[PDB]
Amino acid sequence: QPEFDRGFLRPFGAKMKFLKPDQVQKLSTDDLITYMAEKDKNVRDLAIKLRDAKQDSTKNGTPEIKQKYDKAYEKTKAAAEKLVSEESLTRDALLELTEEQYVEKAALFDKDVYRNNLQRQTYERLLRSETDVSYREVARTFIAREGEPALNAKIERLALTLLDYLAIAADFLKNQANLHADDPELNLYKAETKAREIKANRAMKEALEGADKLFERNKILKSPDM
Amino acid sequence: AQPEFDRGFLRPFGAKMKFLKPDQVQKLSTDDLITYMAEKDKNVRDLAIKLRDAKQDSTKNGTPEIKQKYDKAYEKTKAAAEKLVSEESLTRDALLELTEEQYVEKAALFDKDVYRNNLQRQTYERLLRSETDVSYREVARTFIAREGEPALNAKIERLALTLENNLDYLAIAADFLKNQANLHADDPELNLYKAETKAREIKANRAMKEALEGADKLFERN
Ligand SMILES: [Cl-]
């Protein structure tokens, strides 16, 4: 009786298995692909392409199809190996990473960093999408009551004092809430953004603290006898 | 300078809203009632903008074809604004025909706090729907990857069948996420959806409770 060929992926809902970077370095190439595919969506997408290539090669082993598998396997192995490369795990290389790259790396080796990283990613995504929703709604109301040249002038005043569309849009929405403290739409955006920023900063703090514990950055100093 | 933008019946951006009880609004002039309702209702607002553009075209070119368009645009705004305060819609009998939403949406026009609570409720409800979509799409992608697309299709079909036997995408999507969360308590993506939905539902329920309480206290004053 046939099941479902998952390849290097694990069954849906399976509790993830985390190991310290040294223990992961000791894994077989196959076991490493299984480990990384479960935690990183790039290694997963590559393992799916490797699975389809393995299926084609089994059915018909023509040199065109067999090398398509060889390439697919190599690409997955290269992606998985890069995430645990000794070069990337040096104290020097870990200092060079951004807070985001540092927590995304730690999230592959620690359960709590993984969860905290997932939370920060949803709060940061909603910070961005809610700024665009609000801006496009508030700009429509602004143009209706003040005209489009008046808006372009305000956006110009912001771009002339200060980067990307979302940074200028969030500053516009904040400045207008400070100028009109009685507008419920602007004061709801203001309140909701403050609450989203609090949640994103706490998620990042938790993930960074967990990353420091994992990479052993939190216990460098020991006092001797004075 | 003198660069005065033709606002029409609209007020300056960010202007503090003026709220009156339904009896006081019934006593307003047709022009004052349009100003009152275009500030609070987006349908009356969109019509007032159409009325402003029609008045501008009629001034630019007063053809019988264009003068007829302004008159029609003014009466459409007049009717829409008048309907929101019609005596027949404010009777206890007519207010009971209204859904909790509609009742709160009507009261929002006459009370400041009901307006703020109605706005909060609308944001939290919108995010409840869009976050169910984001999660479903994420969890479905991982499900298909590990179990296959026929396996998902069978689950969605059984869910669509229990629902159609008595369609609603978000209803089906929520039920799928709920069932999977109950089956797999250790999946971080499903645990995050569950936790985030609970926190948002709490916020959405509080906003609608506070809005209904104010809506009751408003239609209580008659
Ligand atoms: Cl299900």
Measured by residues with Cβ under 8 Å of the partner chain's Cβ, the largest interface is: A-B, 34 and 36 residues
Largest sheet of chain A at a glance? Answer: none
Report the span from N to C terminus of chain A. 73 Å
DSSP, total strands of chain A:
0
- The radius of gyration over CA of chain A amounts to 24 Å
Provide a count of the helices of chain A: 10
Percent of residues in helices of chain A = over 70%
Strand content of chain A: under 5%
What is CATH's topology name of chain A?
Answer: Methane Monooxygenase Hydroxylase, Chain G, domain 1
Name the bound molecules. chloride ion
Any guess at the CATH architecture of chain A? Up-down Bundle
Count up the domains of chain A.
1
Coarse shape of chain A: extended
CATH class of chain A: Mainly Alpha
Pairing-aware structural class of the strands and helices of chain A?
mainly alpha
Question: Regarding quaternary structure, how should these chains be classified?
Answer: homodimer
* Secondary-structure element series of chain A: HHHHHHHHHH
PDB class: protein transport
Keywords: plant diseases, immunity, innate, protein multimerization, protein binding, protein transport, membrane translocation, structure-activity relationship virulence factors
Assembly: dimeric
Entry title: Crystal structure of the flax-rust effector avrM
What would your notes on this structure say?
Chain A: This is AvrM. Chain A: It comes from Melampsora lini (Rust fungus). Chain A: Keywords: Signal. Chain A is mainly alpha-helical. Chain A has one domain: Methane Monooxygenase Hydroxylase, Chain G, domain 1, CATH 1.20.58.1680. Helix content of chain A is 73%, strand content 0%. In chain A, helix 2 crosses helix 3, helix 2 packs across helix 4 and helix 7 packs across helix 8. At the A-B interface, helix 7 and helix 10 of A face helix 7 and helix 10 of B. Chloride ion binds next to helix 8 and helix 9 of chain B.
